[PDB]
Amino acid sequence: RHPEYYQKTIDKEGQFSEDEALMELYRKLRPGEPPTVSGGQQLLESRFFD
Amino acid sequence: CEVDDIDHLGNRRVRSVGELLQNQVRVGLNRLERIIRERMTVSDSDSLSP
Amino acid sequence: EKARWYAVQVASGCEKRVKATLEQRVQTLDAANRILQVEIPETPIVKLKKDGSRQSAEEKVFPGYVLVRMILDDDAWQIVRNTPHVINFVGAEQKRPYGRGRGHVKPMPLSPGEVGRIFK
Amino acid sequence: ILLDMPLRDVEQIVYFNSYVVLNPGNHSELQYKQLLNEDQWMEIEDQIYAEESDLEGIEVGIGAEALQQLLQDLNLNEESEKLRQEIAESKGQKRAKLIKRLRVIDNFIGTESRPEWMVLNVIPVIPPDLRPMVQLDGGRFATSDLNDLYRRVINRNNRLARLQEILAPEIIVRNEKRMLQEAVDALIDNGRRGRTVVGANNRPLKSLSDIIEGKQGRFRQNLLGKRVDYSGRSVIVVGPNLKIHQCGLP
DNA sequence: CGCATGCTGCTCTACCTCTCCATGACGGCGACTGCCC
RNA sequence: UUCAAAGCGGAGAGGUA
DNA sequence: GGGCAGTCGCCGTGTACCTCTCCTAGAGCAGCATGCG
């Protein structure tokens, strides 16, 4: 409803594409392992959508 | 919009014998499925019954 | 070419079972190109028992461990780790940044010396 | 404190997570008590094993504890003299660290102890009546929690000795050594450093420190208050016609 | 008329790893950690 | 001359003052 | 380097008495009842 409030976050943290979004999600959830797109996809699917 | 009160009886629930027995049955069934999956593959020829 | 030997840490009491299941897995997955061979080493020593029977006890040199010959690949690593009743690969260990437990392990291939030593 | 190292580095050298340099002799980028890594050790090995030139006096690195060697190398007297000479001049605001080091060094000098005694080579066993076996009503045994921990320690020790006899590959001997460290640590104190060891149920086992430390430990339950003989208990009613200094006993 | 197979009781030993078992307490005190000069 | 066969640890739940 | 806010982990949280219940998994080995031609 108020998009400029979130636009502040967008500007401060930088826009993400799908690939790098999953890369960063995998990096933060499971550190110490090499990032993978399929890894992040499987992690999300097992976490919330199973 | 309004913040929530956690002691309100509209935010609290009652669980009785049915739900707790359901949870115990679920745990036992998960263990049983693990045993079944482990045992089913040990035989090459079928020679098997449910 | 890159046929390296690795040692896999196994749960207590599961040595022949894991080897049999792993051989079935590789033969049904038709992935012999990556996973080559699985083995456990034994030696049939002879011992006197309590009832006087001269019993041939087949003792494992390395209890709790299995030996494989394979080529390191992410798919191969993922499909050997997913085998039931296996803990991890023995190798270099890393500290866990968040939590308390065993972290990422980097497998270490066996040098030709000891694999030639054992296999004879 | 004694080794002038942060706790994280010492904890990494123990538990077989990193290496440590014991002699950096004849090199440029290696310093005493510097933490190496597996790839760093491999790349240094690629140069030391070539034996081309400028690398005589092979440096020693050791991925085990090697805390015994680092603590044996201590030379308390001259370390104390150097620390005093440094503490005499300049204070800033963070000379308290050198004060703590000097205090510990002076304690070890005065007591005439050796720091390397903090690394164990033998352990004692408690007499068997303080960890007894009791029999339940149905004939089942209720053994203590100390017997399980002692059994684990002995089994791992015997297995490691057997492996060392056969000259097994080193990468498995290191795993056995790490497991033995964790077992002895769990016997001494359970759940202090790593993960708690659970027994039959998912409840923790009782270690040697749990006997003495709690509110239900030995100090507060058996030494500062006990059960006694020639004693009784009952309900009280009112007695008139009694004189003060008199009571009525059934 | 007799032959082949599942169920039950006793015995004997051995232990490591996770998806982590929880994410509604509150104060005090000491030891890292990223950030700004 | 001998004694001698009845005592056992932990965990959870509730109560009285 | 000096100086931090900020954060993570360990320590501590009444006394005496009474009643009830329950207490290690897995695998290996040997002897008795049951349906069929």
Curated annotation (Swiss-Prot), chain A:
Coiled-coil blocks: none
Domain of life: Bacteria
Family classification: Belongs to the RNA polymerase beta chain family.
Stated role: DNA-dependent RNA polymerase catalyzes the transcription of DNA into RNA using the four ribonucleoside triphosphates as substrates.
Subunit relationships: In cyanobacteria the RNAP catalytic core is composed of 2 alpha, 1 beta, 1 beta', 1 gamma and 1 omega subunit. When a sigma factor is associated with the core the holoenzyme is formed, which can initiate transcription.
Record protein name field: DNA-directed RNA polymerase subunit beta
Gene: rpoB
Swiss-Prot record, chain D:
Similarity comment text for this entry: Belongs to the RNA polymerase beta' chain family. RpoC1 subfamily.
Main function: DNA-dependent RNA polymerase catalyzes the transcription of DNA into RNA using the four ribonucleoside triphosphates as substrates.
Protein name stated in the entry: DNA-directed RNA polymerase subunit gamma
Quaternary structure annotation from Swiss-Prot or TrEMBL: In cyanobacteria the RNAP catalytic core is composed of 2 alpha, 1 beta, 1 beta', 1 gamma and 1 omega subunit. When a sigma factor is associated with the core the holoenzyme is formed, which can initiate transcription.
Gene: rpoC1
